[PDB]
Amino acid sequence: RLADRALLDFATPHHDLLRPVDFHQAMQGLRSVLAEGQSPELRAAAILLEQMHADEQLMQMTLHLL
Amino acid sequence: HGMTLSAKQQSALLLLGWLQLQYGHPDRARILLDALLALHPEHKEGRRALVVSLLKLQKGSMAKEHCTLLQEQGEQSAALWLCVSRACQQEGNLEEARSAYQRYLAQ
Ligand SMILES: [Br-]
Ligand SMILES: [Br-]
Ligand SMILES: [Br-]
Ligand SMILES: [Br-]
């Protein structure tokens, strides 16, 4: 459990979406592409982020706090 | 136009997966990160997050192979070997885990 912080830091990317206008354009453009995918990996992800629309406020808050 | 993501759309998807991983949903993160790597397999930031998501899912063998791809992409972060060691410990490869952990401390 001690190494969990260093693993999360490794998974954290080292900003282009700081402006809220750019964030909404990125999300709408992302949902349009995955909805056109036919592979089971793209279809499963298109279902998942459609259920994360209520989490968009938590997303933008995390970006600005880094 | 085309089954592809812009630079900002790739970051958005990476952020969606990283948030799931942060909040202890590695299965949901893996779903979003696999899609990002299906459309842009060269996305290194997406792959590192998938490695950690797989470790949290006790999928050490898969996580180690994704680290191998990072290594040959030019990944030179020392924490890469911490993931390899953790992946080998999940699979019982204790001697390989020690070898990888020595490289983590060397760099
Ligand atoms: Br965009
Ligand atoms: Br395409
Ligand atoms: Br496995
Ligand atoms: Br699996």
Author numbering:
A (entry chain B): 50 to 63, 67 to 118
B (entry chain A): -1 to 105
Question: From the publication, what sentences describe this entry?
Answer:
SctX proteins are secreted substrates and are essential components of type III secretion systems. The dedicated chaperone SctY escorts SctX proteins to the secretion machinery, where the hydrophobic helix at the C-terminus of SctX mediates recognition by the export apparatus. The type III secretion substrate SctX binds its chaperone at two distinct sites: (i) its α1 helix interacts with the concave groove of SctY and (ii) the two C-terminal helices α2 and α3 cover the large hydrophobic surface formed by the N-terminal TPR of the chaperone.
We were unable to express A. hydrophila His6-AscY in E. coli, but were able to solubly co-express AscX with P. luminescens subsp. laumondii His6-LscY. The AscX49–LscY complex was reductively methylated to enable crystallization and diffracted to approximately 2 Å resolution. The asymmetric unit contains two heterodimers related via a tNCS vector (0.000, 0.500, 0.500) with a height of 83% compared with the origin Patterson peak. The two AscX49–LscYmeth dimers in the asymmetric unit are virtually identical and both exhibit the α3 bend in the substrate as described for AscX31–YscY. Notably, the bend occurs at the same residue, Ala106. While the C-terminal end of the α2 helix superimposes well between the two complexes, the N-terminal end is rotated by about 13°, resulting in a shift of about 6.1 Å of His76 at the N-terminal end of the helix. Furthermore, the α3 helix appears to be rotated by about 10° in a similar fashion, with Ala106 being displaced by approximately 5.6 Å. A possible explanation for this shift is the presence of Phe12 in YscY instead of Ala10 in LscY, which causes steric conflicts with Met79 in the α2 helix of AscX. An exchange of Phe12 in YscY to Ala10 in LscY and AscY allows the repositioning of SctX helices α2 and α3.
